[PDB]
Amino acid sequence: ATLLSPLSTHVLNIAQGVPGANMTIVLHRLDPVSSAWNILTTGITNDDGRCPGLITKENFIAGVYKMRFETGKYWDALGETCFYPYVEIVFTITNTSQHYHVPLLLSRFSYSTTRGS
Amino acid sequence: LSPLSTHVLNIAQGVPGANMTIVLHRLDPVSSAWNILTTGITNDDGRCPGLITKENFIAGVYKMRFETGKYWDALGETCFYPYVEIVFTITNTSQHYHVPLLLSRFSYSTTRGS
Amino acid sequence: SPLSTHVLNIAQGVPGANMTIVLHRLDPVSSAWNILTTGITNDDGRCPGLITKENFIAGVYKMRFETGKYWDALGETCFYPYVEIVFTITNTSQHYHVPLLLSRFSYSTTRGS
Amino acid sequence: ATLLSPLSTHVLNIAQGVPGANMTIVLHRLDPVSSAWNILTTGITNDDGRCPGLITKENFIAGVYKMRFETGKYWDALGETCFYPYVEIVFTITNTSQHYHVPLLLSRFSYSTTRGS
Numbered sequence A, D: 001a002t003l004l005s006p007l008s009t010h011v012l013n014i015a016q017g018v019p020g021a022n023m024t025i026v027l028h029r030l031d032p033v034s035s036a037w038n039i040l041t042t043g044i045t046n047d048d049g050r051c052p053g054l055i056t057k058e059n060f061i062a063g064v065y066k067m068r069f070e071t072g073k074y075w076d077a078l079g080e081t082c083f084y085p086y087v088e089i090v091f092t093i094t095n096t097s098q099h100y101h102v103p104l105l106l107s108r109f110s111y112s113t114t115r116g117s
Numbered sequence B: 001l002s003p004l005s006t007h008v009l010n011i012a013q014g015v016p017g018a019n020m021t022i023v024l025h026r027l028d029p030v031s032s033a034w035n036i037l038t039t040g041i042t043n044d045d046g047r048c049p050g051l052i053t054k055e056n057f058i059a060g061v062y063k064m065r066f067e068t069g070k071y072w073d074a075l076g077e078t079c080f081y082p083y084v085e086i087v088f089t090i091t092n093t094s095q096h097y098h099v100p101l102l103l104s105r106f107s108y109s110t111t112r113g114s
Numbered sequence C: 001s002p003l004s005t006h007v008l009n010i011a012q013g014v015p016g017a018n019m020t021i022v023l024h025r026l027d028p029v030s031s032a033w034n035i036l037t038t039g040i041t042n043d044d045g046r047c048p049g050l051i052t053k054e055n056f057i058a059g060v061y062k063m064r065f066e067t068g069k070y071w072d073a074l075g076e077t078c079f080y081p082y083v084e085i086v087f088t089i090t091n092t093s094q095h096y097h098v099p100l101l102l103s104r105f106s107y108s109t110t111r112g113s
Helices: A071-077 B068-074 C067-073 D071-076
Strands: A011-013 A024-031 A036-044 A063-069 A087-093 A104-106 A110-114 B008-010 B021-027 B034-041 B060-066 B084-090 B101-103 B107-111 C007-009 C020-026 C033-040 C059-065 C083-089 C100-103 C106-110 D011-013 D024-030 D037-044 D063-069 D087-093 D104-106 D110-114
Touching: A087 A104, A087 B084, B084 B101, C083 C100, C083 D087, D071 D104, D087 D104
Parallel strands: A011 A104, B008 B101, C007 C100, D011 D104
Antiparallel strands: A024 A036, A024 A063, A063 A087, A104 A110, A110 B107, B021 B034, B021 B060, B060 B084, B101 B107, C020 C033, C020 C059, C059 C083, C100 C106, C106 D110, D024 D037, D024 D063, D063 D087, D104 D110
8 A cells, every 4th residue: 555755846848848856855854953964865766756755744844955966966976967957946934734846857058947836 | 347247136026136245255275274355245136346356366165155134134124044155166266256145034056157 | 548638737846627628630631720639637747538549640739728718717817818739640659748837927848758 | 327128028938948049029019099019029039038118118008918939930940849839928007117027938848937026
């Protein structure tokens, strides 16, 4: 019975209209007692550009999170230069009962993100 | 004439993003420290002139931090992103680079322009 | 259903619920648009059953999103009275996701699977 | 002294990070009596992906306009396909005193637009 993470992502390569497979993503959360980023998990996107199992319901607490997408390495492996060596998306979770989809739609020279559910 | 420019557009309201704080940094490639080059605030056209001089514009990895949560809160609204940082590599130093931020409360995009 | 969509209201970070979407196919001889389906997005901003797998033939399609009516029911104006995305389908074995991410003064779309 | 069109555009090719040069653009306005699109101007973008003189101050009245971008043609002269054979942005003008910038930021498999000033 497959466990469903409340935080999901999707990487789409908009230049060829295909998923962003095999991109390294690192999730962090700011520690409020110190003021430092704590690493939570590191994953590699699957062939559908997604990264299931980012975090459990119990660990998904209110806080500030950072997702780092290794875009420079992603494009390097495709044999291409990228304008952005990495992409960090920093976001505030206050409502913990909701699903948060935090995707990266990217080309070599542009990207976008949105909050969804 | 800054070789690096920006423009902030509030896509929720279709107006320039005025008075947003933007800090430009340059990476120390040998350590991995970020150095602050310029701190500015966008004007009523959403622009930030004089981000850097021609003479200080060398190849390297630069970051612009845009103070998005502070911008939205001043307008009476929350933002999903406490700040946005765009990190980009400069190799060819004779080109102009336009690095804009197009944002709502819950989205943002950027593109490399000239 | 090999064609799917998703409407995101990126001003509020919520699904774009109750938006009318009309799907057409171009008559490749006359240049007429033939209506295929008229739907309304659900609470999750999706429109299931846009086309059936049998009826999904190659050619040029248009999805029309009634954006001006969507914002109007929300008590707001939209720069765009409607949005039409026109695309060419050459391979009918694939899934095509044709979404609309919109605010009152912007929008974007992406070919997805 | 230069006459500036109240309606401007900019086409940006976001897969290469260059201006979308030599893109055909056709501006229409909805006819008040027939319910038909009337062609106003046809142009080709310049080397900076822009099209000065889309319309005169005097022709720019309250209305519903459509900007058509020949994206299929544009990509084809670069030797590639596009998912969209053309792109039309239909927009309402009520306030005739403001400047309107209606850009197109395009890859072969994505595009975006915004209302600007």
